[PDB]
Protein backbone atom coordinates (compact mmCIF):
# COMPACT_ATOMS: atom_id res chain seq x y z
CA UNK A 1 0.00 0.00 0.00
CA UNK A 2 0.96 3.66 -0.53
CA UNK A 3 3.74 4.38 1.99
CA UNK A 4 2.40 7.90 2.54
CA UNK A 5 -0.97 6.58 3.66
CA UNK A 6 -1.90 8.46 6.84
CA UNK A 7 -2.67 6.37 9.91
CA UNK A 8 -4.43 7.29 13.09
CA UNK A 9 -3.63 5.18 16.08
CA UNK A 10 -6.06 5.12 18.91
CA UNK A 11 -5.73 3.65 22.34
CA UNK A 12 -5.94 5.18 25.81
CA UNK A 13 -2.52 3.75 26.72
CA UNK A 14 0.70 5.15 25.30
CA UNK A 15 2.54 1.81 25.50
CA UNK A 16 0.28 0.27 22.86
CA UNK A 17 0.13 3.41 20.73
CA UNK A 18 3.92 3.32 20.83
CA UNK A 19 4.14 -0.32 19.74
CA UNK A 20 1.75 0.21 16.85
CA UNK A 21 3.52 3.34 15.68
CA UNK A 22 6.93 1.70 15.72
CA UNK A 23 5.56 -1.36 13.95
CA UNK A 24 4.12 0.87 11.21
CA UNK A 25 7.52 2.53 10.83
CA UNK A 26 9.09 -0.89 10.20
CA UNK A 27 6.52 -1.58 7.48
CA UNK A 28 7.38 1.74 5.89
CA UNK A 29 4.61 4.02 7.20
CA UNK A 30 5.74 7.29 8.81
CA UNK A 31 2.61 9.37 8.33
CA UNK A 32 1.18 8.29 11.68
CA UNK A 33 -0.77 10.16 14.36
CA UNK A 34 -2.11 9.20 17.78
CA UNK A 35 -5.38 9.78 19.60
CA UNK A 36 -6.37 8.83 23.14
CA UNK A 37 -10.05 8.03 22.71
CA UNK A 38 -13.03 8.25 20.41
CA UNK A 39 -13.59 11.98 20.81
CA UNK A 40 -9.92 12.92 20.38
CA UNK A 41 -9.84 10.58 17.37
CA UNK A 42 -12.96 12.05 15.71
CA UNK A 43 -11.55 15.55 16.03
CA UNK A 44 -8.35 14.58 14.24
CA UNK A 45 -10.26 12.64 11.55
CA UNK A 46 -12.26 15.82 11.10
CA UNK A 47 -8.91 17.51 10.38
CA UNK A 48 -8.93 15.30 7.27
CA UNK A 49 -6.19 13.42 5.48
CA UNK A 50 -6.51 10.06 7.24
CA UNK A 51 -6.63 6.85 5.24
CA UNK A 52 -6.59 4.14 7.88
CA UNK A 53 -7.50 3.74 11.56
CA UNK A 54 -6.24 1.31 14.13
CA UNK A 55 -8.14 1.36 17.31
CA UNK A 56 -8.51 -0.03 20.77
CA UNK A 57 -11.91 -0.73 22.29
CA UNK A 58 -11.94 0.14 25.97
CA UNK A 59 -11.32 3.87 26.32
CA UNK A 60 -13.01 6.70 28.27
CA UNK A 61 -15.03 9.49 26.55
CA UNK A 62 -15.87 7.27 23.57
CA UNK A 63 -14.88 3.65 23.28
CA UNK A 64 -13.74 1.87 20.12
CA UNK A 65 -17.05 0.25 19.16
CA UNK A 66 -18.76 3.69 19.25
CA UNK A 67 -15.93 5.23 17.28
CA UNK A 68 -16.29 2.52 14.66
CA UNK A 69 -20.08 3.02 14.47
CA UNK A 70 -19.63 6.76 14.21
CA UNK A 71 -17.03 6.44 11.43
CA UNK A 72 -19.21 4.07 9.34
CA UNK A 73 -22.31 6.21 9.85
CA UNK A 74 -20.66 9.41 8.60
CA UNK A 75 -21.07 9.78 4.84
CA UNK A 76 -17.69 11.50 4.70
CA UNK A 77 -15.68 8.62 6.29
CA UNK A 78 -18.03 5.61 6.05
CA UNK A 79 -15.48 3.38 4.22
CA UNK A 80 -12.46 4.55 6.12
CA UNK A 81 -10.68 1.30 6.98
CA UNK A 82 -10.85 0.63 10.72
CA UNK A 83 -8.76 -2.10 12.31
CA UNK A 84 -9.62 -3.08 15.89
CA UNK A 85 -6.65 -3.84 18.18
CA UNK A 86 -7.99 -4.82 21.57
CA UNK A 87 -7.71 -7.19 24.53
CA UNK A 88 -11.46 -8.04 24.24
CA UNK A 89 -11.48 -11.57 22.88
CA UNK A 90 -14.98 -12.89 23.59
CA UNK A 91 -16.78 -13.99 20.41
CA UNK A 92 -19.63 -11.65 21.38
CA UNK A 93 -17.43 -8.59 21.09
CA UNK A 94 -15.92 -9.72 17.82
CA UNK A 95 -19.42 -10.21 16.41
CA UNK A 96 -20.53 -6.75 17.52
CA UNK A 97 -17.44 -5.07 16.12
CA UNK A 98 -17.59 -7.11 12.91
CA UNK A 99 -21.29 -6.44 12.50
CA UNK A 100 -20.53 -2.80 13.21
CA UNK A 101 -18.35 -2.75 10.14
CA UNK A 102 -14.83 -3.49 11.45
CA UNK A 103 -12.33 -3.96 8.64
CA UNK A 104 -10.40 -6.37 10.86
CA UNK A 105 -9.91 -7.42 14.49
CA UNK A 106 -6.71 -8.23 16.40
CA UNK A 107 -6.57 -9.46 19.99
CA UNK A 108 -3.95 -8.27 22.48
CA UNK A 109 -1.29 -9.37 23.05
CA UNK A 110 -0.11 -9.66 19.45
CA UNK A 111 3.14 -10.21 17.58
CA UNK A 112 4.75 -7.98 14.96
CA UNK A 113 3.94 -10.71 12.47
CA UNK A 114 0.23 -10.85 13.30
CA UNK A 115 -0.28 -7.10 12.81
CA UNK A 116 1.43 -6.89 9.42
CA UNK A 117 -0.53 -9.95 8.34
CA UNK A 118 -3.87 -8.35 9.25
CA UNK A 119 -2.99 -4.99 7.72
CA UNK A 120 -2.07 -6.66 4.45
CA UNK A 121 -5.29 -8.64 4.64
CA UNK A 122 -7.21 -5.38 4.80
CA UNK A 123 -5.11 -3.79 2.06
CA UNK A 124 -5.75 -6.84 -0.12
CA UNK A 125 -9.52 -6.62 0.13
CA UNK A 126 -9.62 -2.87 -0.48
CA UNK A 127 -7.16 -3.06 -3.36
CA UNK A 128 -4.71 -0.75 -1.62
MN1 LIG B 1 -7.74 0.59 26.43
XE1 LIG C 1 -4.53 0.48 18.90
Residues 6 or more apart in contact with residue 104 via CB below 8 angstroms: 83, 84, 118, 119, 121, 122
Resolution of the coordinates in A?
2.4
* DSSP-derived pairing of the beta strands 104-107 and 7-10: unpaired
Q: Are 57 and 65 in contact (CB under 8 A)?
A: yes
In the chain, % helix, strand, coil (3-state, to 5) comes to 45, 15, 40
Report which bound ligand comes closest to the CA of 61: 1
Distance CA 35, CA 107 (A): 19
Q: Are 76 and 98 in contact (CB under 8 A)?
A: no
52-55: strand order across its sheet: 32-35, 7-10, 52-55, 82-86, 104-107
Q: Is 84 in the pocket of ligand 2 (CB under 6 A)?
A: no
Q: Is 11 in the pocket of ligand 2 (CB under 6 A)?
A: yes
Going 70 to 75 to 77 to 82, the CA torsion angle's sign is positive
Q: Is 85 in the pocket of ligand 2 (CB under 6 A)?
A: yes
Q: Are 93 and 107 in contact (CB under 8 A)?
A: no
Task: Give the determination technique.
Answer: X-ray
Distance CA 66, CA 17 (A): 19
Q: Are 20 and 85 in contact (CB under 8 A)?
A: yes
**Ligand 1: distance of its center to the CA of 119 in Å?**
20
- How many other CB atoms sit within 10 Å of the CB of residue 101? 15
> In whole angstroms, what separates CA 105 from the centre of its chain?
9
DSSP string, 55-112: E-S--SSS-HHHHHHHHHHSTTTTT--EEEEES---HHHHHHHHHTT-SEEEESS--H
Binding-site sequence positions for Mg(2+): 11-12, 56, 58
Binding-site sequence positions: 11-12, 56, 58
**Ligand 2: distance of its center to the CA of 15 in Å?**
10
**Ligand 1: distance of its center to the CA of 127 in Å?**
30
Domain coordinates in residue numbering, the chain: 1-128
CATH architecture of the domain formed by 1-128: 3-Layer(aba) Sandwich (3.40)
- How many other CB atoms sit within 10 Å of the CB of residue 102? 20
Amino acid sequence: ADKELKFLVVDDFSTMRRIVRNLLKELGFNNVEEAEDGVDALNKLQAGGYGFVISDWNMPNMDGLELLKTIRADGAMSALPVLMVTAEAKKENIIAAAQAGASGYVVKPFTAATLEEKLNKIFEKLGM
